[PDB]
Design an enzyme around this catalytic site. Structure first.
Site, PDB file in Angstrom:
ATOM      1  CD  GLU A  38      -2.666   1.158   2.517  1.00  0.00           C
ATOM      2  OE1 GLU A  38      -2.013   0.685   3.728  1.00  0.00           O
ATOM      3  OE2 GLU A  38      -3.667   1.371   2.697  1.00  0.00           O
ATOM      4  CD  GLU A  80      -5.839   6.731   4.887  1.00  0.00           C
ATOM      5  OE1 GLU A  80      -5.554   6.324   3.910  1.00  0.00           O
ATOM      6  OE2 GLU A  80      -5.405   6.214   6.183  1.00  0.00           O
TER       7      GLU A  80
END
EC number: 3.2.1.8
Length: 189
Positions: A85, A176
């Site tokens: 990620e 996010e």
């Protein structure tokens, strides 16, 4: 808001995920535009881009990003084999995501120095199920909410440092949040 999930909107892949806590809405707009509005949210990630991404994409983004609390704005994606990620962080709120992380170098790209870091998620959710995997970070020193990201400069610097990426999965410009508030309106191309 739209339903959490993935799909295509106006030619762009999008991903919108939340932990079900409440307090966040995500909308897809014309072209590469998306908006996020959140107030005392849980954890969420949303944005637009490509599936799959590439290792030489020049990603353009523009708009507004107004977090109140813990949030990031970044080029965000995954690789497979190895599972990774990754984040090219252009701006953030109250928390620098590299706090306490091992610094793996620096790279200069698109008008700023970025600091490079590696972290590890242990038995956490991923695109292939629960797994232990590394995360790669480039954290921009000069914060901004418009600009251009030459992803190759980051991926190449990471590789130089021993941070290997596998085959690309999705690659988006993402807002996010982690238990925070804010608003954002971002257009990707």
């Amino acid at each position: 808001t739209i339903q959490p999930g993935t799909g295509y909107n106006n030619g762009y892949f999008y991903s919108y995920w939340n932990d079900g806590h409440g307090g966040v809405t995500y909308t897809n707009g014309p072209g590469g535009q998306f908006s996020v509005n959140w107030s005392n949210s849980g954890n969420f990630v949303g944005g637009k881009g490509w599936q799959p991404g590439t290792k030489n994409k020049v990603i353009n983004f523009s708009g507004s990003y107004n977090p109140n609390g813990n949030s990031y704005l970044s080029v965000y994606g995954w690789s497979r084999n190895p599972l990774i990620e990754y984040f090219i962080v252009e701006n953030f709120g109250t928390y620098n995501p590299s706090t306490g992380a091992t610094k793996l170098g620096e790279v200069t790209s698109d008008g700023s120095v970025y600091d490079i870091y590696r972290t590890q998620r242990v038995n956490q959710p991923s695109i292939i199920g629960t797994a232990t995997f590394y995360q790669y970070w480039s954290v921009r020193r000069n914060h901004r909410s418009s600009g251009s990201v030459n992803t190759a400069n980051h991926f190449n610097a990471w590789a130089q440092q021993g941070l290997t990426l596998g085959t690309m999965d999705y690659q988006i410009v993402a807002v996010e949040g982690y238990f925070s508030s804010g608003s954002a309106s971002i257009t990707v191309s």
